[PDB]
Design a protein around this nucleic acid. Structure first.
Lengths: 207, 274, 234, 274, 234, 234, 274, 207
RNA sequence: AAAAA
RNA sequence: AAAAA
RNA sequence: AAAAA
């Protein structure tokens, strides 16, 4: 005996999703207790082939993953690198030797590379339960954000903004934009893209 | 002992964002489309806190402040036997903002309390000689507690509106003798001569902006608040913030503040039913 | 003692049957800065709750290597009570902040977030009996409003005894003048109790009658919590 | 302000040791050979603190608690003019345990005080209307200070025994008029209707264990205390600890607690001479 | 109210004209341990100030990466007042320590010294009106006595209104019994105001008359500050 | 003053000769958790002491690079006194915690343990005069019970003056009503004094008579300390 | 709660400098050329704090202490109805020394207060029975607040001189009835029987040095203070510091102290005009 | 003139042991002041050839020494190693690179090597007055304690438990055990060795 | 690492 | 990481 | 880095 109790339902903590011994990958949004599966969050029950998941509808923090492209806000300039806000429960750090490509020099101490209030586009090179996320600026189109705007959204909402096969992304960029895993997006003459992208935050559960 | 320190102050707003906030200041308008002299949307829900003698939930943009009053019968302070008491307490709750922590009021919350207290006191809006029950022997103490629930910028102005509102909203009860408050019998309302308003003007480079929001407060050089009664006497002034202002900036700020007070007073009166 | 708590018609001072709850009203996302928030009203008892976090806990030696630290504050505004309450935390507030925290500890999946703190601030805006539970439920709802993963929602109620009658969801008069007052909170789908107290006196049989009546109220409340959270997506 | 935090809590008992403590739980017995429902050895030395009006050094295993009382003549609280006062203070001394630090009572010590206070109060063991001297004008205040000297586990139960013991042990002195306490003349003892006990049951996986020791408290999911008078009315309940319990666990815990109360009450009575 | 503040001859209780300051006396380098110090007397109001720093600020997370942190204390001795003042800091002292700090923040070139603190302790030895400003000026002078770089010196004065007359540099009686009291401090060479308060009530025209009179007093005081600092090298 | 302190028969209120000590009782290893502990009774004055450490001192900037930091607490239970003592530390307790710590500093070989703290908690269970010394000796004994290396044990006694007579080991009445009270503690084998105070008044000759009498009592006490520590191995 | 800790104590004076300070001790003289038994230059400015009832700015080398008194009419403590009150408070201001921080008095400041209080009290210099106005009902409370402005070493001795000076300097005002203090009318001075002095002797290796300066206090094993009245009764003794002294060191210290007291008393008297 | 005042005596702080200029190695349990030697502890006076010592009878802490085999309790799992309780006034640290035999890797963060509540048998590789003790797991029969019990005793009592020429050790292991320098011992079917080994703690001064 | 000086 | 036990 | 909402 192994079934599922809901179709594409709005879901809530403690809510029973399924019974039986499924072979599902671990998720923070579901709790397996013996042969029962529960939602840990306010979210959306969704099913994929023979597996299933809860898509959180709620949540303003980003949980780091290695190789995520993420746009950060520099908060502190330390002696041998920079402490970055990536809107996660953990601050991130970008070591100077990475952004430079060599060890620090005696006659340095400039912030002309990055200061407080600067944005950085970066990739998470290291992260796990034991350590704070470490950043690398190596890849193309990474590093200090000179131009553009930066619009802030719930990280939870990022897959909606991209849209299945970058299709929401398309219907944005056809009218008006880089979407980071971080719930932040980088971006003609004062066209209000954001008035739209906020509407998708506050209507993600429809159409 | 204790001492005032420069805040190590989190709100590191992006360089990029500073440019944007002031961009439309040239056109006389702000990030939220509003005029440099406009206040944010204002709502005032009276009798919000039902076990308060009078109360007012104020929403000014995303700033939210709940003031409530409790009245007790008290000994007059022996140096002022022909007056009742007003005690103003402000709390910046850790609910309000991520970097507020729980503790006794800090320097900002104490300053808030005191600026509001002076404004109410020096306006003569609340005549404490009206709060006497038996002179020399017994009077009302009005405990005014003001709780900042959401820090959306310009909390002082919202504390001042919530305070006046809550005071106007304050029920007074029969006093029975033998002295006791019968709370089944409301005999009056707290007697105020008129409302008061505090109008906060922020300096942002070449610009003076009325009712700064959170982002605007993050970039401002300084702020200066002016309190007015309906006859437009100035009834309190406090410059706060780490930056200076020229004499001309202050001159201009008052002119602007006072022009805004007129409108703000009329709107407060509407909410009060006076 | 002084007032009659159970009237000749078998009803209570506010007209309720002994197995009847006070009315309930819930608002979510009431604060703009908080990561999650809620207002819970049960009769005239009203709390507001605000959640921030998870976020790295700055005095690191106070952090946990495998767990988020929950930081909880139960506080009563001075105008929430009939007589003005001094805003300085009282021993009661100190005890209730602990009891509430420990109730939340069983629900929040804190092991997701090593080295973090999750702050939960609760203020009682009106106290008319049962504020610790209204406070705790507002907290549950705000945590959920913040998208912080949890085992289950927490619903609770005080049962008690008044003029020898087991009653559900006490009011002030019953709290002040009754023979017993027994706040119970649970994760109702997990059949787990997270807060359990009694003050007053009860025979063991009465205690069990009352516990049995609590579970009925709790499940009614749970269903209202669930529907409150679902409401803005419906 | 102030707030309750998850303890960053030292007692990192070895994995190995957890297995061992519960090993014999199957046979109904513990690490110290005792039955899952048994209390540790109990001793009660009365009049231990000689300048206390009444006192009791309680030793429950390696837990050691000294309660002492001081009586003062006082104004009755105006809302209860026909009663005397009971004030309960618990201190978890830094002597007790390596990780206790000196300061005003923390949340655990305050909770201890309050659970004991409720138990004594709600039991009607101590009838405060018996503590009146002149009604309206003057009464006894019983200051009950409870000092935890050695933390060996289950401090609440030992605080409750020390308290009752110390209260039973409380001398009362002549009151002379003109009002003054003559301490050369003991006229009575503190009037109690009966003793009270608190019985703490810990959940350890599938098991419920009465009177947990230090190691058992380190591994328990949670504890729940039940207070009883000799007629076995429940007179207080507090679940503490970060873990939940099922309804059945609570049901079973009370049944077990109450069965233990009977024996514990008889033993306390023996120590008291009643 | 009770006393006449402006006498029939147009003069004040202490014999002064409305545009006339109380007398001023300044001492520098009065303390041996302090890096800089000063005593400022304006009439019978007397403060002492002591500066230490700049020096690395030991609770480093409270430090600023680009700036010195100013740490300021306004305190009144218990025997500085007519009736004994309790030495426990009062709300006024707390507010005035902030207002004074923020005034100093505009003057001290704090960006010279990343990660440092500069401590400024001010004690009022005699309070006869205007102590916050005497305190602030003593601070300016002590900072300078300590060779801590600053934009400018700070001079200030309370103007106000007494029996309908705009007056310069209030005394006690005028402070207690007047209609208005308006402390203003500036960096006079930069035409910048660093402290600005009003308690009482004024029409906007009066406010402007009074502000105009403050600037005159302030410049007189500024010249005395300058000459005080120059004195030991002359 | 009010009572006669020296009776017509030349004896004191409790029947003792002026060079006669109150009786002494000592228990070691009284607490299970403490690294070392003791109870010391001198007449009706009774203290308990508990030692923990040496152990790394967690606020490291408060640690010493070459030395253990001694952390000492002198506290009086509320029921130790004739009238109830408020448990909040009093100025006396604060002074006596320092005086006792500094006495212990000369004895404990703190340089063995760089960067550590050694905690010493002392509670007075009964106060009948001389509690600071009973407290200090309990501390010495508990340190030894903890196997913390020390130069010597500390023995002490208050000598004083009563109705013009030099007396050894004061009691309450003599402490309250006498002309002088002079607590002295030593490392008796090293002839070193570690605590020395006088309150009251004495001529220099009297001071020297009294100091001379203290040393006799101290050596009697020292021998009892030594034998107390040796007892469980005998 | 609270506890006394070994100071982690900054003043790391150079090895080199220790050798130098004591170099001339053999010749009976110090770093500042002074004799091992000499005090530093002493000045005493009375009525320094003009709103104080009596005041004294004391300068002893680079140590500077301002004591001031305020008198209030008060209820006598019910256990001493035929006496007035003396309350001594010492503050080690953060102005005084770089490593003093602002807070309520620490252990050093409290000890200072208490040693001075005992000395004044046990000397019988100030007869509190002289401070009664109506016995049983009303008396003077002398608030003595002592503010250390500059820490140049041996603050206790300077606190004691400032205290006596300030007490001698204390004006007393007419008391009008109906009770009120008329402060336009000074009727007397505070009645003292005589001055008192505290004499602090530091042990520096083989040497005893009177009135240690900052450097000397940094190297001393310990200090011991002796208080004297003009008849050279010892009226207070306190050894402080982490080091021990022999009985002979203490014997010698008193002999030296007392010989210095004679001279110091005569000089204080000169400053007082008695 | 150079003598000794006691035979095999119970000894106490401040107690005079000997007079004269002996050439004795420094000990924490003895204090030389000029030509006199004193006991700093409650202990046992013992003499060996022409030297002598105090055997402490009291004391629950262990004072680290390099090359001591010590059994520790893991307390914290830090990013690059583990903080260990070895019942000393100083916490010990075992660096990950030691227990592994190579530097940490990006994709690590497991505690499958050692977690909190695990015991470790280890050797002290580095220690002195300036630094906290550093551990090495290299030697044979070191590392995580999987099986066994761990009985805790006073480190002061360890030489008695070993017994002159491992002879107490023999009379234990013949009836029932590794004895660490730490006052901890690692160990058929529920035979109560400990009831004995506690009796030796509380009777060390006899026979 | 409350209110007015 | 106030005063005297 | 006291008591009962």
């Amino acid at each position: 005996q192994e079934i599922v109790l809901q179709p594409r339902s709005i879901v809530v903590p403690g809510e029973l999703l399924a019974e039986g011994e499924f072979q599902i990958p671990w998720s923070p949004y579901i709790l397996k207790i013996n042969s029962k599966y529960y939602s840990t969050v306010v979210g959306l029950f969704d099913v994929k082939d023979t597996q299933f998941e809860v898509i959180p509808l709620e949540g303003s923090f980003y949980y780091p993953k290695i190789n995520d492209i993420v746009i950060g806000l520099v908060e502190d300039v330390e002696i041998y690198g920079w402490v970055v806000d990536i809107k996660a429960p953990y601050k991130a750090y970008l070591p100077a030797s990475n952004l430079l490509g060599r060890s620090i020099n005696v006659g340095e101490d400039l912030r002309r590379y990055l200061d407080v209030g600067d944005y950085v586009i970066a990739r998470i090179e290291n992260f796990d339960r034991s350590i704070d996320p470490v950043l690398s600026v190596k890849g193309k189109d990474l590093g200090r954000v000179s131009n553009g705007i930066v619009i802030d959204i719930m990280p939870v909402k990022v897959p909606r903004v991209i849209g299945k096969n970058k299709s929401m992304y398309e219907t944005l960029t056809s009218k008006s934009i880089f979407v980071a895993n971080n719930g932040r997006i980088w971006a003609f003459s004062e066209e209000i893209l954001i008035e739209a992208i906020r509407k998708i935050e506050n209507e993600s559960h429809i159409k | 002992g204790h001492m005032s320190s420069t805040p190590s102050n989190q709100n590191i707003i992006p360089i990029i964002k500073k440019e944007s906030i002031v961009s439309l200041f040239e056109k006389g308008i702000r990030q939220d489309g509003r005029k440099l002299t406009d206040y944010r949307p204002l709502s005032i829900t009276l009798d919000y806190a039902k076990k308060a003698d009078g109360s007012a939930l104020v929403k000014l943009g995303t700033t939210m402040v709940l003031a409530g009053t409790k009245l007790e019968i008290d000994k007059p302070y022996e140096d002022t036997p022909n007056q009742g008491n007003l005690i103003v307490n402000v709390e910046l709750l850790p609910l309000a903002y991520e970097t507020f922590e729980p503790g006794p009021p800090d320097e900002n919350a104490i300053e808030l309390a005191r600026v509001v207290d002076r404004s109410l006191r020096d306006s003569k809006a609340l005549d404490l000689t009206k709060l006497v029950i038996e002179p020399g022997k017994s009077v009302w103490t009005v405990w005014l507690d003001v709780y900042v629930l959401d820090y959306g910028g310009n909390v002082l102005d919202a504390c001042t509106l919530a305070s006046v509102a809550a005071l106007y909203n304050t029920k007074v009860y029969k006093v029975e003798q033998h002295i006791s408050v019968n709370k089944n019998e409301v005999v009056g309302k707290l007697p105020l001569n008129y409302p008061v308003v505090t109008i906060s003007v922020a300096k942002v480079d070449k610009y003076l902006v009325v009712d700064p929001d959170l982002d605007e407060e993050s970039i401002m050089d300084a702020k200066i608040s002016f309190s007015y009664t309906p006859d437009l006497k100035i009834v309190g002034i406090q410059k706060s913030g780490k930056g200076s202002m020229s004499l001309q900036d202050i001159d201009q700020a008052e002119n602007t503040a006072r022009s805004t007070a007129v409108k703000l007073l009329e709107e407060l009166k509407k909410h009060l039913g006076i | 003692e002084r007032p009659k708590l159970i009237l000749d018609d078998g009803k209570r001072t506010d007209g309720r049957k002994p197995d009847e709850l006070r009315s309930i009203k819930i608002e979510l996302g009431v604060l703009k800065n908080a990561d999650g928030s809620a207002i819970f009203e049960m009769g005239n008892t009203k709390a507001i709750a605000a959640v921030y976090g998870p976020k790295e806990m700055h005095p690191r030696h106070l952090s946990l290597p495998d767990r988020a630290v929950l930081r909880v504050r139960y506080h009563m505004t001075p105008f929430s009570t009939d007589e003005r309450k001094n805003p300085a935390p009282s021993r009661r507030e100190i005890e209730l902040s602990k009891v509430i925290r420990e109730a939340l500890e069983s629900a929040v999946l804190v092991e997701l977030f090593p080295r973090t703190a999750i702050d939960v601030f609760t203020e009682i805006l009106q106290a008319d009996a049962g504020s610790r539970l209204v406070s705790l439920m507002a907290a549950s709802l705000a945590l959920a409003d913040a998208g912080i993963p949890m085992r289950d929602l927490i619903a609770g109620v005080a049962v008690g005894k008044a003029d020898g009658v087991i009653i559900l969801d006490l009011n002030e008069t019953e709290a002040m003048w009754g023979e017993a007052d027994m706040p119970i909170a649970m994760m109702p789908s997990l059949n787990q109790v997270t807060l359990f107290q009694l003050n007053g006196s009860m025979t063991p049989d009465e205690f069990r009658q009352a516990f049995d009546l609590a579970v009925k109220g709790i499940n009614i409340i749970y269903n209202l919590e669930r529907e409150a959270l679902k409401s803005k997506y419906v």
